[PDB]
């Protein structure tokens, strides 16, 4: 049946608590069942969801939302539980504060009074700027104007939660194998969760917007990457509605000929994939190093910027991308900046344009840098060797003995993650020399890998020197969503990408990240002039690019060959947040036959023309909400 959506998921969630988690694995299992104030339509506009109307004050500090009447919470079995009301959003944000949400960075400095409730300086949540004025009138008060505030409302920390239900479940609330431990107000009900097996939804047949829901069921099968041919195999059997293809699969020639008229390439996504550098490694349960001298050498090397730049310039991103995309389409996915270069624009200049204007202050090697997607602007063997020569002399003068050994962990179930890291290893070793740098690939189980990367509890658990196991996707429409998370104080995310969680660590001072904090904070204070705000965030990105503390490699999604039975451009389109069609399947339509590449390309050109129209119409309509 076309109305039975089938695909895959890649990691069991640690929790169903969408208010507390910053991990996509929670979004994957909850977005289809939980709506907030807005969703995204198929052109990327904010669409009314639980908010039927909204207004903002002239000074931009007070947002008021009329809650749609008659929207119900339902159990996983379709039992009506309660009305959705403004109080559920008050409770949602209170729970996020009380239980110390991993995503608090995007609310703590925006909602008035929240930072003081978070720390305990204020004891009553009534002093926080979220108010149920009445059952269907929800009001937020902010510390400063935020043109991107409404875009935050498609992210999960701003979803509602019924307090009666939360309290009644107690310690059983939001348990990751128990769909009865949440309630659902969205287009689907979460019906099943089986570890390392399946995630299951059914259509919410009492949903207020069920007219825009065109799937009866959703089934996601667990996929750990050990059998990458299973995606196309299950598509062709009719089990899956979609299949991402891997041109390095041994049977790919047969698939390519079979589906010659159907394989098409998606646009690069907004999230960043690359390699984080652990600047403060604590644990060595996964290492090839055998002496303390080797461990000190690696620790000093990673604090040396020239050493990090040598790795950055040595990485052949086309070869890396080709381990999942094949040589022909590899360039499409390459990315040279943490922030997607066209994520925002200031007039005619992209964010990448602004970064490129400022980067050459750090060094002539950045002059003429091409930061655009779709080409490798950073790979340069000559510059990599030059930077390592500078690092070698500084490190030898400090008694460091070479080669520098770098532990990089891999999930031994994901064949093409191993292949990507093997390509990183060959890049660094061929350009800099194994006499100088050795990349020691640490193979481990899926669960062992999760517990030192994606689900690492703390910086001590980041048992690696360099890792590409975790990407970052933007949560709302402002460069802060990328750049704030690497500030010395954003300990939830600094452990994941940089290996530290102590904001005052000596390693953190040594690499100069307190300077990065000041650039980020100076950009954040610009609320008057968006062009100036973006120029200032580009100064922070410029510092980050030069620091090479994160090595960008490719877009974390998209830029891939795919097969589809989904009617092109019927799904939600979202650059940020938790309501895009990667996790949220309202609006999406399915069809009998496999989409042809010509059908997709024609729909895309027509969609691009309608999207520019619809987006401009939406922007012109914003003034009508200033009250």
């Amino acid at each position: 049946a076309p109305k039975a959506y089938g695909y895959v998921y890649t990691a069991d969630p640690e929790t169903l608590d969408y208010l507390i988690s910053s991990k996509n694995s929670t979004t994957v299992v909850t977005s289809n069942g939980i709506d907030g104030l807005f969703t995204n339509d198929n052109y990327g506009n904010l669409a009314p969801a639980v908010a039927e109307d909204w207004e903002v004050s002239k000074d931009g500090l007070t947002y008021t939302y009329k809650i749609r009447k008659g929207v119900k919470w339902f159990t996983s079995d379709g039992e009506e539980y309660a009305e959705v009301t403004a109080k559920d959003f008050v409770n949602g944000l209170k729970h996020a504060a009380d239980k110390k949400s991993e995503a608090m960075y995007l609310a703590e400095n925006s909602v008035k009074g929240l930072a003081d409730y978070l720390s305990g300086t204020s004891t009553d949540f009534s002093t926080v700027g979220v108010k149920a004025v009445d059952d269907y009138t929800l009001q937020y008060t902010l510390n400063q104007p935020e043109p991107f505030w409404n875009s935050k409302l498609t992210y999960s920390i701003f979803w509602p939660l019924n307090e009666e239900f939360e309290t009644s479940k107690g310690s059983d609330f939001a348990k990751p194998t128990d769909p009865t431990s949440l309630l659902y107000n969205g287009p689907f009900l979460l019906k099943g969760l089986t570890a390392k097996s399946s995630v299951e939804f059914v259509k919410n047949e009492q949903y207020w917007d069920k007219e825009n829901v065109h799937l009866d069921t959703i089934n996601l099968a667990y996929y750990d990457g050990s059998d990458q041919e299973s995606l196309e195999r299950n598509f062709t059997s009719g089990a899956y509605s979609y299949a991402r293809l891997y041109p390095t699969s041994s049977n790919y020639s047969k698939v390519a000929e079979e589906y010659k008229d159907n394989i098409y390439y998606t646009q690069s996504g907004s999230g960043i994939a690359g390699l984080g550098v652990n600047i403060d490694r604590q644990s060595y349960n996964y290492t090839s190093k055998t002496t303390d001298s080797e461990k000190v050498a690696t620790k000093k090397a990673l604090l040396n910027k020239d050493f990090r730049q040598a790795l950055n310039f040595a990485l052949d991103r086309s070869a890396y991308s080709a381990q999942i995309n094949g040589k022909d389409g590899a360039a499409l996915a390459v990315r040279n900046l943490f922030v997607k270069p066209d994520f925002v624009s200031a007039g005619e200049k992209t964010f990448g344009d602004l970064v490129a204007a400022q980067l050459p202050a750090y060094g002539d090697e950045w002059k003429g840098v091409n930061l655009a997607d779709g080409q490798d602007g950073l790979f340069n063997a000559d510059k990599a060797k030059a930077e390592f020569a500078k690092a070698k002399k500084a490190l030898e003068a400090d008694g460091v003995q070479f080669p520098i050994h770098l532990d990089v962990p891999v999930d031994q179930a994901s064949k093409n993650y191993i292949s990507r890291i093997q390509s990183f290893k060959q890049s660094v070793e061929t350009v800099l020399g194994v006499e100088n740098v050795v990349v020691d690939i640490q193979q481990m189980t899926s669960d062992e890998f999760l517990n030192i990367t994606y689900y690492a509890a703390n910086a001590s658990s980041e048992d690696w020197d360099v890792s590409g196991g975790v990407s970052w996707g933007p949560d709302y429409q402002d460069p802060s969503t990328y750049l704030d998370i690497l500030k010395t104080t954003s300990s939830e995310t600094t452990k994941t990408y940089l290996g530290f969680d102590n904001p005052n660590s000596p390693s953190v001072v040594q690499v100069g990240l307190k300077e990065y904090d000041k650039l980020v904070d100076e950009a954040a204070r610009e609320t008057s002039d968006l062009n100036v705000r973006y120029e200032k965030y580009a100064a922070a990105q410029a510092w980050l690019t030069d620091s090479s503390l994160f090595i960008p490699a490719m877009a974390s999604s998209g830029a891939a060959p795919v097969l589809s039975r989904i009617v092109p451009f019927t799904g939600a389109s979202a650059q940020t947040g938790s309501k895009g069609s990667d996790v949220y399947f309202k609006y999406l339509k399915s069809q009998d036959k496999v989409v042809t590449k010509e059908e997709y390309e024609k729909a895309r050109e027509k969609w691009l023309k309608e999207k520019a129209e619809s987006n401009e119409k939406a922007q012109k309509e914003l003034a009508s909400h200033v009250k």
């Binding site: 895959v8 991402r244 970052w472 891939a560």
Partner: peptide, 10 residues
């Protein structure tokens, strides 16, 4: 949002 890169299914 943090996402795992070991499998790139989209």
């Amino acid at each position: 949002a943090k996402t795992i890169k070991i499998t790139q299914t989209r």
